Amino acid sequence: EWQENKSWNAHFTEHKSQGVVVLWNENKQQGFTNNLKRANQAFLPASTFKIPNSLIALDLGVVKDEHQVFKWDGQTRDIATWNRDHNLITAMKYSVVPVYQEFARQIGEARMSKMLHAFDYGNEDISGNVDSFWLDGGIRISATEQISFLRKLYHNKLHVSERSQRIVKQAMLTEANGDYIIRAKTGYSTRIEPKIGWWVGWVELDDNVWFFAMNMDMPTSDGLGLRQAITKEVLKQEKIIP
Amino acid sequence: EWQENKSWNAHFTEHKSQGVVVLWNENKQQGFTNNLKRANQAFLPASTFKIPNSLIALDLGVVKDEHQVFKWDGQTRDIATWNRDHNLITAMKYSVVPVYQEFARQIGEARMSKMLHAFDYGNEDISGNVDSFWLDGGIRISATEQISFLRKLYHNKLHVSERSQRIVKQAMLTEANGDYIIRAKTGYSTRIEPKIGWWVGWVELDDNVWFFAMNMDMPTSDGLGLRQAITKEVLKQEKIIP
Structure with missing residues (x-):
């Protein structure tokens, strides 16, 4: 059911990094990882929390749809792309924390709590x-728990409308060509050690789905591009993408 | 409102071809084409008809969802990718005529006719x-009429469920990266002269949508790759994609 493939450590080593890639072959119901222990180590979800936050926001009507504009509060922040108006598509793409903080306040703690229990998140x-709990509060999730959650979203099995699930899956769209589709969400946890980068989602093929969840040590923002680069090196080695 | 840009003819000429590209800037409500007359010349839609056919199939419950398997009828045809099971995603991707012919028979002519009137198609x-009417019957549509129909689909304004429209837009997904998303449908009209290639859909940007509809003379299948190559040359020249 779960197999360790330590040869993937070569892709971390190449980039002077350490972390875990977890793959799940949906057709075969079989998982693969370079490190079973780290696969099951729980970290702050950081911006990967935008997936459940989007679902709850949509289902409660805090977000009407993926076109509704969320006005910049006019406070210049660190990331140029944050200092503008956003919709759900662009807020996900650019990991626009302040937009999701506003979602979180309107959702409120009673409903946020009830929904994360319903999602088994x-x-x-x-x-x-x-x-801010997904940045410096109590919420923790492992790579393998990310995959469990993503599988429910892919199959429209989470306790929210089909519509909410379809809209978030649209918002997760990251890459597509004639060979594959990637629906995914990046994350960078900086507020509590260890500082980690996340990439979680799935690769849609004609005849299968490969779920993935990876995290890696991210002492500085310089290595953030390694989240995708290392995941793709593993996907390529396993012949999941060309 | 409409501007002719004959410089795009260079991209057709380079590939020893003839045809039209029509662009529509959604924000500015402004169209651009290399040939206003050909932009308004109606042809058989061929496999571009898979967009309205999918919508009507989904809305009438002929197709439950994008995962439902359409069993190969076991008749070996000319196109390898047709001789296998398909769902709506793979049937669109590979233009699997036989699957859509079965949809058409279950829809029936009274409902097909009522729906194309409702769609103003x-x-x-x-x-x-x-x-087979979209291959060798009476239905005709221009590049500009394709854009009018696509605009209604993009905005969920067609007289079918939001769900149907979301599922077909998912099924149209062709290409995505950090710069743009292309949702589109190819077509090749071969059964009545003149033989033409179609590519219709849109480019999603952060802050805008550019609708496109192109057709070109397609005497043999050798040039089918020119549909995308020439459309992208135009999109690049207009700085819509890098």
């Missing part, structure tokens, strides 16, 4: 600020 | 076989 713990 | 004429 990581440790289901929202302790801290309703608008 | 080309000349709204289904004369011919209910299961």
